[PDB]
Write a protein that binds this ligand. Structure first.
Ligand SMILES: N#Cc1c(NC(=O)c2ccccc2F)sc2c1CCCC2
Length: 319
Protein backbone atom coordinates (compact mmCIF):
# COMPACT_ATOMS: atom_id res chain seq x y z
CA UNK A 1 0.00 0.00 0.00
CA UNK A 2 1.39 3.38 -1.14
CA UNK A 3 -1.34 5.34 0.70
CA UNK A 4 -2.77 5.79 4.18
CA UNK A 5 -5.87 7.45 5.60
CA UNK A 6 -6.39 10.04 8.31
CA UNK A 7 -9.35 12.09 9.58
CA UNK A 8 -9.30 15.90 9.59
CA UNK A 9 -12.86 16.48 10.86
CA UNK A 10 -15.19 14.01 9.05
CA UNK A 11 -13.00 14.45 5.97
CA UNK A 12 -10.89 11.37 5.34
CA UNK A 13 -7.65 12.31 3.58
CA UNK A 14 -6.21 9.20 1.96
CA UNK A 15 -2.80 10.28 0.77
CA UNK A 16 0.56 9.03 -0.48
CA UNK A 17 2.86 8.02 2.36
CA UNK A 18 5.38 10.76 1.39
CA UNK A 19 3.05 13.43 2.75
CA UNK A 20 3.31 13.56 6.58
CA UNK A 21 1.74 15.35 9.55
CA UNK A 22 -1.45 16.72 7.99
CA UNK A 23 -3.01 19.85 9.44
CA UNK A 24 -5.98 21.87 8.09
CA UNK A 25 -5.37 25.37 6.75
CA UNK A 26 -8.45 26.28 4.71
CA UNK A 27 -11.97 25.79 3.32
CA UNK A 28 -13.59 28.43 1.09
CA UNK A 29 -13.21 21.70 -0.93
CA UNK A 30 -10.80 20.68 1.86
CA UNK A 31 -7.14 21.76 2.08
CA UNK A 32 -4.22 20.58 4.24
CA UNK A 33 -0.68 21.51 5.07
CA UNK A 34 1.76 18.61 5.18
CA UNK A 35 5.43 17.73 5.23
CA UNK A 36 6.54 16.00 2.06
CA UNK A 37 9.24 13.46 2.93
CA UNK A 38 10.55 13.16 -0.64
CA UNK A 39 11.01 16.89 -1.26
CA UNK A 40 11.95 17.75 2.32
CA UNK A 41 9.68 20.77 2.28
CA UNK A 42 6.12 21.79 3.10
CA UNK A 43 3.16 21.40 0.76
CA UNK A 44 -0.53 22.18 0.69
CA UNK A 45 -2.97 19.41 -0.24
CA UNK A 46 -6.46 19.93 -1.48
CA UNK A 47 -8.91 17.08 -1.87
CA UNK A 48 -11.69 17.30 -4.43
CA UNK A 49 -14.66 15.17 -3.17
CA UNK A 50 -16.31 13.34 -6.12
CA UNK A 51 -15.57 16.43 -8.27
CA UNK A 52 -17.77 14.90 -10.96
CA UNK A 53 -21.01 15.03 -8.94
CA UNK A 54 -22.49 17.47 -11.55
CA UNK A 55 -21.73 19.57 -14.65
CA UNK A 56 -20.65 22.58 -12.51
CA UNK A 57 -18.05 20.89 -10.25
CA UNK A 58 -16.78 18.68 -13.04
CA UNK A 59 -16.34 21.43 -15.65
CA UNK A 60 -14.28 23.58 -13.21
CA UNK A 61 -12.31 20.64 -11.72
CA UNK A 62 -11.37 19.50 -15.22
CA UNK A 63 -10.46 22.95 -16.57
CA UNK A 64 -8.45 23.79 -13.44
CA UNK A 65 -6.75 20.46 -13.53
CA UNK A 66 -5.63 20.97 -17.14
CA UNK A 67 -4.52 24.63 -16.91
CA UNK A 68 -2.71 24.38 -13.52
CA UNK A 69 -0.36 21.91 -15.19
CA UNK A 70 -0.44 23.79 -18.55
CA UNK A 71 0.21 27.39 -17.25
CA UNK A 72 3.61 28.43 -15.87
CA UNK A 73 4.17 31.66 -13.91
CA UNK A 74 5.54 32.52 -10.41
CA UNK A 75 2.33 34.39 -9.53
CA UNK A 76 -0.03 31.53 -10.48
CA UNK A 77 -0.36 28.24 -8.59
CA UNK A 78 1.32 25.22 -10.01
CA UNK A 79 1.04 21.63 -9.00
CA UNK A 80 3.90 19.56 -7.66
CA UNK A 81 1.65 16.51 -7.93
CA UNK A 82 -1.84 15.07 -8.60
CA UNK A 83 -3.16 11.69 -7.42
CA UNK A 84 -6.20 9.55 -6.65
CA UNK A 85 -5.93 6.65 -4.20
CA UNK A 86 -8.60 4.62 -6.05
CA UNK A 87 -7.02 2.23 -8.53
CA UNK A 88 -9.70 1.80 -11.19
CA UNK A 89 -12.01 4.07 -13.16
CA UNK A 90 -14.94 2.33 -11.48
CA UNK A 91 -13.78 2.96 -7.91
CA UNK A 92 -12.44 6.43 -8.80
CA UNK A 93 -13.81 8.90 -6.23
CA UNK A 94 -11.32 11.64 -5.23
CA UNK A 95 -8.57 13.82 -6.63
CA UNK A 96 -5.78 15.33 -4.54
CA UNK A 97 -3.87 18.40 -5.74
CA UNK A 98 -0.49 19.26 -4.25
CA UNK A 99 1.16 22.67 -4.27
CA UNK A 100 4.03 24.57 -2.59
CA UNK A 101 2.84 25.65 0.84
CA UNK A 102 1.81 29.27 1.27
CA UNK A 103 1.25 30.90 4.67
CA UNK A 104 -1.84 33.05 4.39
CA UNK A 105 -4.89 34.15 2.46
CA UNK A 106 -5.40 37.67 1.12
CA UNK A 107 -8.36 38.17 3.53
CA UNK A 108 -5.74 38.01 6.27
CA UNK A 109 -3.37 40.54 4.71
CA UNK A 110 -6.20 43.11 4.12
CA UNK A 111 -6.85 43.10 7.92
CA UNK A 112 -3.36 44.54 8.54
CA UNK A 113 -2.17 48.08 8.37
CA UNK A 114 0.16 47.83 5.46
CA UNK A 115 2.71 50.19 4.04
CA UNK A 116 2.78 51.25 0.43
CA UNK A 117 5.88 49.13 -0.07
CA UNK A 118 4.04 45.86 0.61
CA UNK A 119 0.65 46.86 -0.68
CA UNK A 120 2.19 47.96 -4.03
CA UNK A 121 4.31 44.82 -4.35
CA UNK A 122 1.22 42.71 -3.77
CA UNK A 123 -0.72 44.66 -6.40
CA UNK A 124 2.23 44.48 -8.80
CA UNK A 125 2.19 40.70 -8.41
CA UNK A 126 -1.53 40.40 -9.14
CA UNK A 127 -1.17 42.42 -12.28
CA UNK A 128 1.75 40.26 -13.47
CA UNK A 129 -0.20 37.06 -12.95
CA UNK A 130 -3.38 38.54 -14.38
CA UNK A 131 -1.23 39.80 -17.24
CA UNK A 132 0.17 36.30 -17.77
CA UNK A 133 -3.27 34.56 -17.81
CA UNK A 134 -4.52 37.10 -20.38
CA UNK A 135 -1.56 36.41 -22.66
CA UNK A 136 -2.65 32.80 -22.43
CA UNK A 137 -6.25 33.39 -23.40
CA UNK A 138 -7.45 33.34 -19.76
CA UNK A 139 -9.56 36.27 -18.65
CA UNK A 140 -10.20 35.34 -14.99
CA UNK A 141 -13.21 37.55 -14.10
CA UNK A 142 -13.48 36.20 -10.58
CA UNK A 143 -10.58 37.51 -8.49
CA UNK A 144 -11.09 37.67 -4.76
CA UNK A 145 -8.87 37.69 -1.65
CA UNK A 146 -9.82 34.13 -0.77
CA UNK A 147 -8.51 32.61 -4.05
CA UNK A 148 -5.24 34.53 -3.66
CA UNK A 149 -2.43 33.31 -1.37
CA UNK A 150 0.62 34.86 0.19
CA UNK A 151 4.02 33.80 1.64
CA UNK A 152 5.67 35.57 4.58
CA UNK A 153 8.20 37.22 2.26
CA UNK A 154 5.16 38.78 0.49
CA UNK A 155 5.27 36.58 -2.67
CA UNK A 156 1.77 36.05 -3.99
CA UNK A 157 -0.05 33.46 -6.06
CA UNK A 158 -3.45 33.30 -7.68
CA UNK A 159 -5.13 29.99 -6.79
CA UNK A 160 -7.74 29.39 -9.48
CA UNK A 161 -8.56 30.19 -13.09
CA UNK A 162 -11.90 31.96 -12.97
CA UNK A 163 -15.21 31.45 -14.75
CA UNK A 164 -15.38 29.85 -18.25
CA UNK A 165 -20.45 32.55 -3.54
CA UNK A 166 -18.61 35.85 -2.86
CA UNK A 167 -19.69 38.34 -5.58
CA UNK A 168 -18.24 41.67 -4.33
CA UNK A 169 -15.18 41.80 -6.57
CA UNK A 170 -16.98 41.15 -9.82
CA UNK A 171 -16.89 43.86 -12.50
CA UNK A 172 -20.00 45.87 -13.57
CA UNK A 173 -19.96 43.95 -16.85
CA UNK A 174 -20.19 40.69 -14.93
CA UNK A 175 -22.80 42.00 -12.41
CA UNK A 176 -24.81 43.11 -15.45
CA UNK A 177 -23.55 40.38 -17.81
CA UNK A 178 -22.50 42.38 -20.85
CA UNK A 179 -19.40 40.97 -22.56
CA UNK A 180 -15.96 41.90 -21.36
CA UNK A 181 -12.33 42.56 -22.21
CA UNK A 182 -9.13 41.74 -20.35
CA UNK A 183 -9.62 44.79 -18.07
CA UNK A 184 -12.59 43.12 -16.41
CA UNK A 185 -9.90 41.76 -14.04
CA UNK A 186 -8.69 45.29 -13.24
CA UNK A 187 -12.00 46.07 -11.55
CA UNK A 188 -11.45 43.23 -9.13
CA UNK A 189 -7.89 44.36 -8.31
CA UNK A 190 -9.31 47.80 -7.74
CA UNK A 191 -11.84 46.34 -5.28
CA UNK A 192 -9.08 44.49 -3.52
CA UNK A 193 -6.77 47.48 -3.37
CA UNK A 194 -9.63 49.58 -1.91
CA UNK A 195 -10.47 47.11 0.84
CA UNK A 196 -6.77 47.20 1.80
CA UNK A 197 -7.17 50.91 2.48
CA UNK A 198 -10.73 51.07 3.80
CA UNK A 199 -10.90 47.75 5.67
CA UNK A 200 -14.50 47.21 4.53
CA UNK A 201 -15.90 45.49 1.49
CA UNK A 202 -16.29 48.27 -1.12
CA UNK A 203 -19.48 46.88 -2.71
CA UNK A 204 -21.36 44.49 -0.35
CA UNK A 205 -24.87 43.14 -0.85
CA UNK A 206 -27.31 40.27 -0.39
CA UNK A 207 -27.33 40.01 -4.21
CA UNK A 208 -26.52 41.91 -7.41
CA UNK A 209 -29.38 44.41 -6.77
CA UNK A 210 -27.87 45.70 -3.46
CA UNK A 211 -24.41 45.33 -5.00
CA UNK A 212 -25.05 47.60 -7.99
CA UNK A 213 -26.64 50.09 -5.54
CA UNK A 214 -23.39 50.26 -3.59
CA UNK A 215 -21.54 50.84 -6.86
CA UNK A 216 -23.65 53.78 -8.01
CA UNK A 217 -23.80 55.65 -4.65
CA UNK A 218 -20.04 55.81 -4.36
CA UNK A 219 -19.08 56.09 -8.00
CA UNK A 220 -22.24 57.69 -9.32
CA UNK A 221 -24.53 56.71 -12.15
CA UNK A 222 -22.40 56.04 -15.27
CA UNK A 223 -22.53 58.24 -18.39
CA UNK A 224 -24.90 57.67 -21.44
CA UNK A 225 -22.38 55.95 -23.81
CA UNK A 226 -21.96 53.19 -21.21
CA UNK A 227 -25.76 52.62 -21.08
CA UNK A 228 -25.88 52.43 -24.90
CA UNK A 229 -23.92 49.16 -24.62
CA UNK A 230 -26.37 47.44 -22.24
CA UNK A 231 -28.95 45.06 -23.71
CA UNK A 232 -32.58 46.35 -23.85
CA UNK A 233 -33.74 44.70 -20.65
CA UNK A 234 -30.73 45.34 -18.39
CA UNK A 235 -30.41 48.84 -19.83
CA UNK A 236 -33.98 49.54 -18.73
CA UNK A 237 -33.26 48.46 -15.10
CA UNK A 238 -30.01 50.50 -14.91
CA UNK A 239 -31.49 53.82 -16.22
CA UNK A 240 -34.45 53.42 -13.78
CA UNK A 241 -32.58 53.19 -10.46
CA UNK A 242 -32.52 56.42 -8.42
CA UNK A 243 -29.59 58.32 -9.98
CA UNK A 244 -26.67 59.37 -7.71
CA UNK A 245 -23.97 62.00 -8.33
CA UNK A 246 -21.13 59.92 -6.92
CA UNK A 247 -18.45 60.90 -4.39
CA UNK A 248 -14.96 61.84 -5.59
CA UNK A 249 -11.99 59.64 -4.72
CA UNK A 250 -10.49 61.84 -1.98
CA UNK A 251 -13.88 61.59 -0.26
CA UNK A 252 -14.03 57.83 -0.86
CA UNK A 253 -10.51 57.38 0.50
CA UNK A 254 -9.72 60.29 2.87
CA UNK A 255 -6.06 60.98 3.73
CA UNK A 256 -6.93 59.62 7.21
CA UNK A 257 -6.66 56.07 5.89
CA UNK A 258 -3.08 56.70 4.71
CA UNK A 259 0.26 57.24 6.50
CA UNK A 260 1.05 61.00 6.48
CA UNK A 261 4.19 60.89 8.69
CA UNK A 262 6.61 61.60 5.79
CA UNK A 263 6.83 63.05 2.27
CA UNK A 264 7.35 59.59 0.71
CA UNK A 265 4.08 58.35 2.18
CA UNK A 266 2.32 61.58 1.23
CA UNK A 267 3.41 61.15 -2.37
CA UNK A 268 2.55 57.44 -2.22
CA UNK A 269 -0.94 58.17 -0.95
CA UNK A 270 -1.54 60.58 -3.82
CA UNK A 271 -0.40 57.94 -6.35
CA UNK A 272 -2.35 55.18 -4.70
CA UNK A 273 -5.53 57.23 -4.69
CA UNK A 274 -4.89 58.10 -8.35
CA UNK A 275 -4.66 54.42 -9.39
CA UNK A 276 -7.75 53.42 -7.41
CA UNK A 277 -9.69 55.98 -9.55
CA UNK A 278 -8.52 54.44 -12.80
CA UNK A 279 -9.33 50.95 -11.60
CA UNK A 280 -12.63 51.76 -9.97
CA UNK A 281 -14.25 52.95 -13.15
CA UNK A 282 -17.58 51.46 -14.17
CA UNK A 283 -17.18 51.84 -17.94
CA UNK A 284 -14.59 49.35 -19.33
CA UNK A 285 -13.93 51.80 -22.16
CA UNK A 286 -12.63 54.30 -19.55
CA UNK A 287 -11.14 51.78 -17.07
CA UNK A 288 -7.32 51.36 -17.04
CA UNK A 289 -5.67 48.41 -18.88
CA UNK A 290 -3.37 45.89 -17.16
CA UNK A 291 -0.30 47.05 -19.10
CA UNK A 292 -0.95 50.65 -18.10
CA UNK A 293 -1.55 49.83 -14.40
CA UNK A 294 1.80 48.08 -14.47
CA UNK A 295 3.12 51.46 -15.71
CA UNK A 296 1.51 53.47 -12.95
CA UNK A 297 4.13 55.12 -10.67
CA UNK A 298 2.54 53.46 -7.66
CA UNK A 299 3.28 50.13 -9.37
CA UNK A 300 6.24 50.64 -11.76
CA UNK A 301 8.66 50.78 -8.80
CA UNK A 302 8.73 46.93 -8.95
CA UNK A 303 9.28 46.23 -12.68
CA UNK A 304 -20.33 16.17 -20.64
CA UNK A 305 -22.35 13.73 -18.36
CA UNK A 306 -21.49 12.57 -14.84
CA UNK A 307 -20.14 9.34 -16.41
CA UNK A 308 -18.18 11.16 -19.13
CA UNK A 309 -16.53 13.77 -16.91
CA UNK A 310 -15.41 11.08 -14.51
CA UNK A 311 -13.32 9.58 -17.34
CA UNK A 312 -12.03 12.85 -18.73
CA UNK A 313 -10.77 13.80 -15.26
CA UNK A 314 -9.41 10.34 -14.55
CA UNK A 315 -7.34 10.42 -17.73
CA UNK A 316 -5.90 13.76 -16.64
CA UNK A 317 -5.12 12.45 -13.11
CA UNK A 318 -3.52 9.44 -14.88
CA UNK A 319 -1.44 11.62 -17.21
N1 LIG B 1 -0.87 27.09 0.01
C1 LIG B 1 -1.97 27.28 0.33
C2 LIG B 1 -3.34 27.51 0.65
C3 LIG B 1 -4.40 26.99 -0.09
N2 LIG B 1 -4.30 26.17 -1.24
C4 LIG B 1 -5.31 25.71 -2.09
O1 LIG B 1 -6.47 26.01 -1.92
C5 LIG B 1 -4.95 24.85 -3.25
C6 LIG B 1 -5.55 25.12 -4.48
C7 LIG B 1 -5.24 24.35 -5.60
C8 LIG B 1 -4.34 23.31 -5.48
C9 LIG B 1 -3.76 23.03 -4.25
C10 LIG B 1 -4.05 23.79 -3.14
F1 LIG B 1 -3.44 23.49 -1.99
S1 LIG B 1 -5.78 27.47 0.61
C11 LIG B 1 -5.16 28.34 1.80
C12 LIG B 1 -3.77 28.28 1.73
C13 LIG B 1 -2.88 28.99 2.73
C14 LIG B 1 -3.68 29.48 3.97
C15 LIG B 1 -5.04 30.10 3.57
C16 LIG B 1 -5.94 29.09 2.85
Amino acid sequence: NQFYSVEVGDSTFTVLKRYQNLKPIGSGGIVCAAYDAVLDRNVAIKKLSRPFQNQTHAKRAYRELVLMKCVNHKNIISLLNVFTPQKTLEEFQDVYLVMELMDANLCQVIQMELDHERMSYLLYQMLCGIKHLHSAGIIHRDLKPSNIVVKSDCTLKILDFGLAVTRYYRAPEVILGMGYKENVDIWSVGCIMGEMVRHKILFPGRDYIDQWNKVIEQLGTPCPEFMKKLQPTVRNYVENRPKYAGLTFPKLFPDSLFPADSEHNKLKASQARDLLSKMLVIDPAKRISVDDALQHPYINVWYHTIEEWKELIYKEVMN
